[PDB]
Amino acid sequence: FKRAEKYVKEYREQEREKIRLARIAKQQGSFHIPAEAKLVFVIRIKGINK
Amino acid sequence: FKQAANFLWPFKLSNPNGGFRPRKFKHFIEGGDLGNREEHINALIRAMN
Amino acid sequence: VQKKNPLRNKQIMLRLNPYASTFAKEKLGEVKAEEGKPPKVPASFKELLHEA
Amino acid sequence: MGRLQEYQVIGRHLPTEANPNPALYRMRIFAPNEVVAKSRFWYFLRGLKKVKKATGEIVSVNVISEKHPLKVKNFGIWLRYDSRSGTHNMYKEYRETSRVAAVEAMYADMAARHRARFRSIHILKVVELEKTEDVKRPYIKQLVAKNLSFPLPHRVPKISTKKIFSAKRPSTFS
Amino acid sequence: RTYRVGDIVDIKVNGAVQKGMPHKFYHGKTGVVYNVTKSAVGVIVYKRVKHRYIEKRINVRIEHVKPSRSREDFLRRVKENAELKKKAKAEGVPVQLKRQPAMPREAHTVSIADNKPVTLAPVAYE
RNA sequence: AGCGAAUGAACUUUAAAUAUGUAAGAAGCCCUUGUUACUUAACUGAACGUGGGCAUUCGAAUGUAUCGACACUAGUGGGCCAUUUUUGGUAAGCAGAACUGGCGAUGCGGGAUGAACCGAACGCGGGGUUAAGGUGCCGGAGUGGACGCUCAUCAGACUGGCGCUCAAGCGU
């Protein structure tokens, strides 16, 4: 239960942190380039033939 | 992340509800489904899960 | 003997995640944004947008 | 190509110790989503200034919404089409309410008349003919003429395609 | 150049001397020496066929064979790994030993000041 | 790309794309010292004897329902098609090399029959969703929507037949 507390708050504050950084960098004559994705999901969608 | 992802069996997904693009054996940039779709993959996941 | 979807069965979700009841009770999925007057977009950004 | 959107893609070389603070190249790309916009931006910066996706990054990708999409206006678009013979430069006029709509019509027109693809068209520039008489296409000049008014004869009535049999023969005066 | 028996040797094959030349499948390859003569040198080189590997023993003389620079990374890596592990044990701090596969980039901001973006078009007309 | 650097594809600060060999610690590392049947002017190297410390990133990633050796036992030695790279000739086809994938030994959905090619590879069933291909009728599913073009005295069909023309044709 306590770990779920911390995890949900962690998710919401990273979302708001990215949004706030983008907004303030847009205001101060800059361009905040988001961090590149560390996680990818790969789906094989073609058959196992040729 | 090695052990957490290796512990999970590969996800056996269903076919997408709503189908693929009309020519899915072509890159996503050229109006297909192959390659990197980035965040749009969420929609594909929402169709296949 | 029978796998039950936690997204459909609320008891299975409460078994796996005890926080689901107070996540739904305290409305942490409908959280509101920070209050106060938001500032306006800088003119430099607008002149960069509609350039030649 | 679908719901095209005008994207402001700013991109720059990767910063190095020898060459810090790059030039921040910016381009306007009409693409259905952001991934196509970024790819076309690199396709163009590979062509022009010789920077690459592996040695570069995207500074920003912003939607450029039309300022007044409730006002009909005249657009003049310059474009380069690689044909079987070779590359040719053209210029076409369109009466649309938004730059996006003009580019969508352009793509439909060059697909219908010249059989041109998305990958075989390079939109040089899209301008608005603010002043009257700037339009040179006779069809567009007909629409810009004084006090236009035309009737709609032989209007096919929208009947249901699942209404198979009709008792009364229809009329085309509506 | 002097060559031992059991050293990793790469061959490049020039066209200066046509005596004892190997085929273009062996052009620019790498192998292990098992035989040294007055002029020629016997090298084992691996070969692909369908699903498997066959070792082949070939003879090239001196002017096309040279000691390879593939292994010195191993010796430099073991030397630095030993030395920073010695410093880590002396100073009592943890230090990083392996090779990292170069994680993607983090977040940063770029200033519009003194770096005003330029607008471009598919063709560079000037 | 530059040569507002030198020099001149053979120019180069930088550097593609594209494929292919080798190495990624414990069967390991480094250095110091004796011996040897070897080697060289000579530990110049090689091998046999040295020592040290590293098992809590033990020295990238990912996978790992495992691999090596020894011994024993059946059936087989066709060719064809396609791709990538390369050489030569002909009026044009074509001829010579390596490469993988398949067929022989393969059923199913499409493909107008086949075959090639596209999808996808097979226990017996129920439900759901798709791939390739389609939605005028035969034939399950749109006489669906937006923009233009075409009337052809045997048009055209991502046509088989009927047939179709602000399409049931073509491009998006």
XYZ file of C-alpha atoms (C1' of nucleotides) in Angstrom:
623
model
C 0.000 0.000 0.000
C 2.795 2.447 0.873
C 4.715 1.594 -2.299
C 1.568 2.226 -4.362
C 1.260 5.625 -2.619
C 4.774 6.559 -3.697
C 4.445 5.132 -7.226
C 1.217 6.951 -8.133
C 2.574 10.235 -6.768
C 5.821 9.570 -8.688
C 3.930 9.181 -11.985
C 1.833 12.316 -11.517
C 4.797 14.492 -10.543
C 6.925 13.339 -13.492
C 4.041 14.257 -15.824
C 3.636 17.703 -14.246
C 7.431 18.158 -14.144
C 7.769 17.596 -17.897
C 4.841 19.937 -18.597
C 6.251 22.678 -16.341
C 9.740 22.417 -17.874
C 8.270 22.703 -21.375
C 6.187 25.743 -20.383
C 8.986 27.657 -18.647
C 11.468 26.924 -21.440
C 8.905 28.164 -23.954
C 8.627 31.372 -21.914
C 12.357 32.069 -21.414
C 13.120 32.178 -25.141
C 14.202 28.548 -25.304
C 13.067 25.086 -26.462
C 12.982 22.196 -23.967
C 13.917 19.020 -25.892
C 12.236 16.077 -24.020
C 14.389 13.149 -22.967
C 14.535 10.315 -25.479
C 12.425 7.261 -24.715
C 14.117 4.562 -22.647
C 11.391 1.935 -23.163
C 9.952 0.486 -26.370
C 7.247 -2.092 -27.059
C 7.877 -4.321 -30.076
C 5.082 -6.315 -31.730
C 5.903 -8.910 -34.374
C 2.989 -8.535 -36.852
C 4.363 -10.588 -39.792
C 4.191 -14.406 -40.223
C 6.931 -17.004 -39.513
C 7.118 -18.171 -43.182
C 9.514 -16.517 -45.703
C 14.957 -4.261 -16.029
C 16.679 -7.347 -17.476
C 15.161 -9.709 -14.927
C 11.749 -8.019 -14.764
C 11.296 -8.126 -18.546
C 12.777 -11.620 -18.889
C 10.479 -12.907 -16.139
C 7.456 -11.869 -18.198
C 6.445 -14.280 -20.932
C 6.095 -12.638 -24.373
C 2.679 -11.032 -24.686
C 0.345 -13.068 -26.898
C -1.796 -10.274 -28.329
C -4.987 -10.629 -30.323
C -5.609 -9.168 -33.751
C -6.514 -5.453 -33.644
C -10.149 -4.490 -33.238
C -10.678 -2.264 -36.245
C -7.986 -3.937 -38.328
C -4.660 -2.674 -39.566
C -4.007 -0.009 -42.174
C -5.150 -0.951 -45.717
C -1.550 -1.904 -46.609
C 0.163 -2.914 -43.367
C 3.288 -4.454 -44.949
C 4.786 -1.027 -45.539
C 6.459 1.567 -43.347
C 4.409 3.756 -41.011
C 5.741 6.905 -42.765
C 4.427 5.622 -46.126
C 0.936 4.933 -44.758
C 1.550 1.445 -43.415
C 2.122 -0.305 -40.093
C 5.772 -1.423 -40.076
C 8.593 0.412 -38.350
C 8.525 3.054 -35.645
C 5.158 4.652 -34.889
C 6.382 6.058 -31.519
C 3.464 7.110 -29.229
C 0.885 5.929 -31.794
C 1.783 2.364 -30.719
C -0.538 2.981 -27.742
C -3.511 2.958 -30.111
C -2.247 -0.303 -31.607
C -1.922 -1.723 -28.096
C -5.448 -0.520 -27.328
C -6.613 -2.440 -30.385
C -4.670 -5.621 -29.625
C -5.144 -5.915 -25.855
C -8.198 -22.657 -12.466
C -9.629 -19.567 -14.206
C -7.765 -16.328 -14.858
C -9.890 -13.302 -13.966
C -9.183 -9.888 -15.461
C -8.419 -7.314 -12.726
C -9.664 -4.551 -15.038
C -13.071 -6.260 -15.177
C -13.165 -7.942 -11.741
C -12.755 -5.401 -8.944
C -12.098 -8.038 -6.269
C -9.080 -9.365 -8.177
C -7.749 -5.805 -8.476
C -8.240 -5.283 -4.733
C -6.385 -8.561 -4.160
C -3.411 -7.551 -6.313
C -3.521 -3.810 -5.513
C -4.959 -2.737 -2.126
C -4.674 0.937 -3.183
C -7.392 0.694 -5.870
C -10.226 1.392 -3.411
C -8.709 4.644 -2.142
C -7.462 5.544 -5.618
C -11.097 5.476 -6.734
C -12.371 7.010 -3.479
C -10.024 10.009 -3.359
C -10.358 10.639 -7.145
C -6.595 10.671 -7.933
C -7.521 10.005 -11.607
C -9.574 13.246 -11.844
C -6.903 15.445 -10.113
C -7.147 19.173 -11.054
C -4.292 21.464 -12.163
C -2.547 24.169 -10.156
C -4.643 27.311 -9.695
C -3.621 30.857 -10.570
C -3.644 33.031 -13.670
C -1.636 31.392 -16.481
C 0.736 33.754 -18.402
C 0.338 34.565 -22.148
C 2.511 33.064 -24.972
C 5.563 35.313 -25.790
C 5.313 37.361 -29.046
C 8.679 35.936 -30.202
C 7.171 32.417 -30.248
C 4.182 33.717 -32.292
C 6.345 35.553 -34.850
C 8.476 32.391 -35.165
C 5.317 30.269 -35.768
C 3.833 32.327 -38.634
C 7.031 33.016 -40.541
C 7.548 32.952 -44.313
C -2.583 12.682 -47.596
C -5.348 12.354 -44.978
C -5.768 15.146 -42.398
C -2.488 16.972 -43.231
C -1.269 19.397 -40.507
C 1.285 22.237 -40.925
C 4.186 21.410 -38.541
C 6.989 23.836 -37.547
C 9.944 21.398 -37.260
C 13.098 23.015 -35.772
C 16.208 20.767 -35.798
C 19.977 21.129 -35.306
C 23.280 19.261 -35.533
C 24.495 17.475 -32.430
C 26.720 19.767 -30.331
C 30.431 18.976 -30.276
C 33.468 20.394 -28.508
C 34.848 21.678 -31.816
C 31.480 23.003 -33.067
C 29.148 24.093 -30.266
C 25.876 26.026 -30.685
C 24.557 24.838 -34.100
C 22.487 26.846 -36.576
C 18.961 25.621 -35.575
C 17.496 24.892 -39.000
C 13.685 25.304 -39.131
C 11.233 24.076 -41.843
C 7.445 23.982 -42.365
C 6.243 20.473 -43.332
C 2.640 19.475 -44.234
C 2.322 15.934 -42.774
C -0.515 13.805 -41.219
C 1.336 13.316 -37.919
C 4.573 14.297 -36.202
C 6.612 11.187 -37.154
C 6.162 11.920 -40.919
C 6.973 15.624 -40.270
C 10.286 14.711 -38.534
C 11.193 12.152 -41.268
C 10.438 14.622 -44.133
C 12.370 17.376 -42.253
C 15.462 15.089 -42.161
C 14.879 14.053 -45.832
C 15.079 17.783 -46.636
C 18.015 18.591 -44.352
C 19.894 15.618 -45.793
C 19.320 17.306 -49.140
C 20.044 20.935 -48.260
C 22.456 21.528 -45.372
C 23.880 17.971 -45.099
C 22.991 17.017 -41.545
C 21.748 13.548 -40.643
C 19.289 11.935 -38.249
C 22.099 10.003 -36.544
C 24.177 13.182 -36.093
C 21.257 15.533 -35.384
C 18.214 16.001 -33.125
C 14.764 17.710 -33.305
C 14.568 21.006 -31.313
C 10.759 21.468 -31.645
C 7.643 20.263 -33.609
C 4.740 22.770 -33.319
C 1.282 22.841 -34.951
C 0.768 26.034 -37.005
C -3.059 26.458 -36.850
C -4.691 28.782 -39.450
C -5.255 32.280 -37.949
C -8.674 32.829 -39.637
C -10.156 29.461 -40.847
C -13.673 31.013 -41.278
C -12.530 33.370 -44.112
C -12.255 32.128 -47.756
C -8.937 33.263 -49.341
C -6.731 32.654 -52.426
C -3.603 30.471 -52.218
C -0.790 30.252 -54.729
C 1.519 27.241 -54.318
C 4.917 26.652 -56.012
C 5.931 22.953 -56.317
C 8.577 20.688 -57.963
C 7.320 17.348 -59.403
C 9.788 14.609 -60.377
C 8.225 13.000 -63.452
C 9.436 10.148 -65.663
C 11.268 12.661 -67.864
C 12.589 14.765 -64.995
C 11.859 17.454 -62.441
C 9.508 20.279 -63.435
C 8.442 23.416 -61.570
C 4.766 24.364 -61.432
C 2.541 26.921 -59.713
C -1.159 26.455 -58.989
C -4.007 28.477 -57.469
C -6.670 27.187 -55.014
C -9.712 28.905 -53.373
C -9.651 27.422 -49.821
C -10.285 28.678 -46.241
C -6.968 27.248 -44.887
C -3.377 26.554 -46.105
C -3.861 22.872 -45.077
C -7.010 22.600 -47.278
C -5.130 24.162 -50.247
C -2.266 21.601 -49.877
C -4.812 18.720 -49.570
C -6.598 19.931 -52.766
C -3.185 20.343 -54.441
C -2.339 16.714 -53.676
C -5.697 15.503 -55.005
C -5.341 17.658 -58.145
C -1.783 16.545 -58.939
C -2.781 12.939 -58.295
C -5.793 13.206 -60.619
C -4.247 15.185 -63.484
C -0.515 14.355 -63.457
C -0.561 11.063 -61.457
C 1.954 12.483 -58.971
C 2.737 10.771 -55.667
C 3.359 12.164 -52.192
C 7.069 11.302 -52.414
C 7.391 12.867 -55.887
C 6.145 16.386 -54.954
C 8.301 19.052 -53.200
C 6.158 22.013 -51.972
C 8.560 24.963 -52.570
C 6.296 27.610 -50.925
C 2.586 28.347 -50.162
C 1.550 32.056 -50.290
C -1.834 33.847 -49.992
C -2.943 36.177 -52.845
C -4.130 38.991 -50.497
C -4.504 41.462 -53.423
C -7.153 40.768 -56.128
C -5.836 40.245 -59.764
C -2.778 38.382 -58.320
C -4.645 35.147 -59.281
C -3.735 34.045 -62.853
C -5.796 30.790 -63.043
C -8.917 31.623 -65.181
C -11.212 29.320 -63.102
C -10.239 31.164 -59.862
C -10.678 34.588 -61.594
C -14.237 33.493 -62.603
C -15.069 32.922 -58.878
C -13.484 36.319 -57.917
C -15.662 38.217 -60.446
C -18.203 40.893 -59.577
C -21.525 39.840 -58.007
C -21.376 36.092 -58.643
C -24.676 34.202 -58.694
C -25.364 30.835 -60.376
C -28.415 28.477 -60.232
C -28.220 24.696 -59.525
C -30.122 22.896 -62.377
C -30.693 19.083 -62.552
C -30.008 18.561 -58.802
C -30.087 14.760 -58.150
C -32.244 14.284 -54.974
C -30.472 12.334 -52.197
C -32.595 9.176 -52.162
C -31.817 6.285 -49.834
C -29.706 3.553 -51.409
C -31.670 1.033 -49.334
C -34.989 2.357 -50.679
C -35.155 0.013 -53.651
C -38.569 0.747 -55.178
C -40.196 4.177 -55.444
C -43.831 4.783 -56.349
C -43.290 8.236 -57.887
C -40.671 9.173 -60.466
C -38.382 11.780 -58.872
C -37.828 15.413 -59.799
C -34.539 17.295 -60.161
C -35.810 20.826 -59.482
C -34.505 20.940 -55.899
C 58.561 -8.763 -39.758
C 58.929 -11.908 -37.638
C 55.944 -14.160 -36.941
C 55.379 -16.689 -34.165
C 53.270 -19.861 -34.187
C 49.909 -19.066 -32.616
C 49.527 -15.328 -33.204
C 46.428 -13.687 -34.680
C 47.403 -12.531 -38.176
C 45.321 -10.649 -40.733
C 45.932 -10.862 -44.478
C 45.126 -8.170 -47.042
C 46.649 -9.558 -50.285
C 48.170 -7.027 -52.681
C 48.874 -7.530 -56.373
C 52.604 -6.801 -56.239
C 53.784 -10.443 -56.222
C 51.585 -13.185 -57.680
C 53.444 -16.096 -56.045
C 51.362 -18.033 -53.522
C 48.358 -15.739 -53.773
C 45.090 -16.771 -52.086
C 41.586 -16.425 -53.479
C 39.350 -13.356 -53.080
C 37.285 -15.233 -50.484
C 40.418 -15.016 -48.317
C 41.060 -11.391 -49.342
C 41.304 -9.209 -46.236
C 40.749 -12.018 -43.720
C 42.053 -12.969 -40.272
C 43.422 -16.256 -38.948
C 45.811 -18.049 -36.584
C 49.321 -19.186 -37.530
C 50.269 -22.844 -37.064
C 53.150 -23.151 -39.553
C 56.102 -20.884 -40.399
C 58.520 -21.518 -43.288
C 61.430 -19.630 -44.839
C 58.945 -17.650 -46.949
C 55.361 -18.891 -46.546
C 53.224 -19.119 -43.402
C 50.437 -21.594 -42.629
C 47.282 -19.970 -41.260
C 44.023 -21.530 -40.097
C 41.001 -19.475 -41.166
C 37.350 -20.280 -40.490
C 34.957 -20.728 -43.404
C 31.164 -20.578 -43.673
C 29.211 -23.263 -45.513
C 25.397 -23.466 -45.208
C 24.872 -24.024 -41.476
C 28.386 -24.794 -40.225
C 32.046 -23.803 -39.939
C 35.061 -25.551 -41.485
C 38.642 -24.581 -40.631
C 40.928 -24.269 -43.660
C 44.736 -24.292 -43.672
C 46.216 -21.845 -46.190
C 49.727 -20.640 -47.099
C 50.591 -16.932 -47.523
C 54.093 -15.445 -47.471
C 55.317 -12.365 -45.708
C 54.322 -9.262 -47.664
C 50.538 -9.758 -47.321
C 50.354 -11.077 -43.728
C 50.655 -8.826 -40.686
C 49.931 -9.026 -36.943
C 46.357 -7.977 -36.275
C 45.244 -5.061 -34.100
C 42.090 -6.773 -32.805
C 43.477 -8.187 -29.538
C 45.152 -5.079 -28.012
C 41.743 -3.867 -26.809
C 41.616 -6.955 -24.572
C 44.987 -6.209 -22.952
C 44.273 -2.502 -22.505
C 40.855 -3.327 -21.015
C 42.248 -5.858 -18.530
C 45.018 -3.410 -17.551
C 42.669 -0.487 -16.875
C 40.079 -2.743 -15.200
C 42.754 -4.040 -12.818
C 44.139 -0.557 -12.163
C 40.855 1.249 -11.398
C 39.759 -1.743 -9.331
C 42.996 -1.317 -7.358
C 42.231 2.390 -6.888
C 38.632 1.558 -5.913
C 39.825 -0.934 -3.293
C 42.418 1.557 -2.023
C 39.976 4.478 -1.744
C 37.011 2.333 -0.654
C 34.551 3.614 -3.272
C 32.593 1.799 -6.010
C 33.609 2.494 -9.596
C 32.281 1.398 -12.987
C 34.184 -1.372 -14.793
C 32.088 -2.724 -17.693
C 31.327 -1.128 -21.059
C 28.045 0.668 -21.365
C 26.056 0.467 -24.618
C 25.472 4.269 -24.747
C 21.992 5.004 -23.333
C 19.864 7.634 -25.143
C 20.153 11.341 -24.458
C 18.596 13.238 -21.557
C 16.581 16.476 -21.513
C 18.036 19.947 -22.040
C 17.110 23.386 -23.356
C 18.590 25.334 -26.299
C 18.441 29.168 -26.303
C 16.848 31.208 -29.081
C 19.142 34.106 -28.166
C 21.941 34.636 -30.738
C 20.653 31.495 -32.528
C 17.563 32.704 -34.401
C 16.334 29.822 -36.610
C 16.406 30.200 -40.386
C 13.514 29.138 -42.606
C 14.314 26.760 -45.495
C 12.572 25.339 -48.616
C 13.042 21.939 -50.431
C 15.169 23.640 -53.176
C 18.026 26.074 -52.333
C 17.306 28.941 -54.742
C 19.800 31.816 -54.688
C 30.822 18.288 -47.892
C 34.973 21.619 -48.218
C 39.278 23.280 -50.707
C 36.938 31.906 -47.434
C 42.376 24.387 -44.809
C 46.725 22.447 -47.597
C 47.514 19.538 -51.781
C 45.582 17.525 -56.253
C 37.384 8.878 -57.801
C 42.822 8.807 -57.408
C 42.500 16.577 -53.458
C 41.446 15.867 -48.265
C 39.811 18.224 -41.684
C 35.401 15.037 -41.289
C 32.875 11.070 -43.123
C 28.702 7.858 -45.334
C 25.468 3.886 -47.200
C 26.237 -1.215 -47.691
C 27.876 -6.106 -46.495
C 31.950 -9.612 -44.293
C 36.442 -11.901 -41.041
C 38.763 -11.428 -35.879
C 38.658 -10.440 -29.849
C 35.206 -9.256 -25.489
C 38.920 -12.983 -18.337
C 39.307 -17.542 -14.532
C 40.686 -22.380 -20.419
C 42.114 -14.725 -17.601
C 46.004 -10.458 -16.694
C 50.639 -8.302 -16.141
C 55.506 -7.947 -15.167
C 60.449 -10.322 -12.697
C 63.910 -14.562 -12.448
C 66.325 -19.689 -13.710
C 66.363 -24.086 -17.382
C 65.826 -26.099 -22.469
C 66.431 -30.024 -27.613
C 64.872 -24.726 -30.512
C 65.884 -19.709 -32.535
C 68.787 -15.279 -33.362
C 74.861 -11.201 -32.529
C 72.058 -11.394 -27.948
C 65.078 -14.256 -22.970
C 65.756 -11.941 -29.701
C 61.509 -14.644 -29.060
C 59.078 -19.796 -27.816
C 58.215 -23.776 -24.050
C 59.013 -25.635 -19.025
C 59.684 -23.803 -13.623
C 58.083 -17.689 -10.952
C 55.189 -14.194 -7.921
C 51.036 -10.994 -7.004
C 46.178 -9.595 -6.367
C 41.370 -9.324 -8.699
C 34.732 -13.984 -7.243
C 30.273 -7.878 -3.033
C 29.637 -4.747 -12.180
C 34.322 -11.420 -12.494
C 35.183 -7.014 -16.349
C 29.223 -5.095 -23.082
C 23.916 -6.209 -25.047
C 20.104 -9.907 -25.734
C 18.543 -14.949 -25.748
C 19.655 -19.415 -23.282
C 13.258 -25.808 -22.841
C 21.765 -26.366 -23.223
C 26.432 -27.755 -25.385
C 31.154 -30.613 -26.451
C 33.689 -35.322 -27.183
C 33.688 -40.644 -28.040
C 31.303 -44.997 -30.118
C 27.355 -47.199 -33.168
C 23.099 -47.026 -37.282
C 19.153 -46.064 -41.934
C 17.881 -42.766 -46.529
C 20.303 -39.463 -50.029
C 23.903 -37.404 -53.910
C 18.604 -34.009 -58.723
C 18.150 -29.932 -60.823
C 14.768 -25.463 -61.343
C 13.077 -20.458 -60.121
C 13.987 -15.624 -57.841
C 17.212 -11.863 -55.294
C 22.189 -9.154 -54.377
C 27.102 -8.321 -56.372
C 30.403 -9.002 -60.740
C 32.343 -10.096 -66.001
C 31.510 -10.531 -71.421
C 28.651 -10.600 -76.004
C 24.506 -9.989 -79.309
C 19.998 -6.470 -83.816
C 17.642 -8.055 -79.160
C 17.287 -12.023 -76.049
C 21.798 -14.263 -73.458
C 26.315 -16.712 -71.259
C 29.923 -17.465 -66.716
C 30.600 -17.123 -60.921
C 29.180 -16.943 -55.283
C 24.533 -15.980 -52.114
C 20.131 -17.288 -49.453
C 14.782 -18.749 -49.819
C 11.691 -22.567 -51.652
C 10.409 -27.235 -54.498
C 11.062 -32.215 -54.410
C 8.243 -33.946 -49.040
C 2.822 -28.760 -48.123
C -2.420 -28.610 -46.807
C -5.423 -23.500 -46.160
C -7.214 -17.783 -47.825
C -6.391 -14.880 -52.428
C -4.592 -14.863 -57.333
C -9.574 -16.392 -63.708
C -8.830 -21.897 -63.749
C -3.701 -23.868 -62.683
C 1.555 -22.457 -62.367
C 4.318 -18.235 -60.812
C 3.225 -14.344 -57.144
C 0.759 -12.247 -52.176
C -0.874 -13.811 -47.191
C -0.143 -17.532 -43.850
C 2.099 -22.537 -42.670
C -2.082 -27.661 -40.441
C -4.809 -32.020 -33.749
C -10.909 -32.000 -33.006
C -14.653 -27.953 -31.867
C -17.367 -23.038 -30.097
C -16.907 -17.573 -29.955
C -14.214 -13.009 -31.375
C -10.579 -10.327 -34.708
C -7.750 -9.943 -38.968
C -3.777 -10.797 -43.191
C -3.537 -10.970 -48.679
C -7.708 -9.791 -51.416
C -12.356 -7.458 -51.764
C -17.828 -4.755 -50.840
C -23.126 -3.730 -58.806
C -24.857 -9.280 -59.530
C -22.949 -14.313 -59.796
C -20.380 -13.801 -54.167
C -20.089 -12.729 -48.073
C -19.453 -7.371 -47.504
C -20.710 0.240 -49.738
C -24.675 1.059 -56.316
C -20.140 4.635 -49.335
C -17.865 9.796 -49.152
C -14.195 14.218 -51.294
C -11.556 16.081 -55.713
C -10.618 15.932 -61.106
C -10.013 13.213 -66.091
C -11.826 9.780 -70.106
C -16.671 8.361 -74.828
C -12.617 4.528 -77.191
C -16.459 1.637 -85.196
C -15.401 -4.078 -80.594
C -12.189 2.044 -74.512
C -10.709 0.665 -69.838
C -10.868 -2.459 -65.464
C -5.641 -2.453 -58.944
C -11.910 -7.140 -65.649
C -13.992 -14.642 -65.538
C -19.193 -14.004 -67.171
C -23.282 -10.628 -67.097
C -22.629 -5.984 -67.787
C -20.886 -0.739 -66.545
C -19.845 5.550 -68.575
C -21.376 12.540 -62.991
C -18.594 3.956 -63.588
C -19.226 -1.141 -61.738
C -12.721 2.902 -65.437
C -8.242 5.747 -63.729
C -4.958 8.714 -59.629
C -4.981 10.224 -54.397
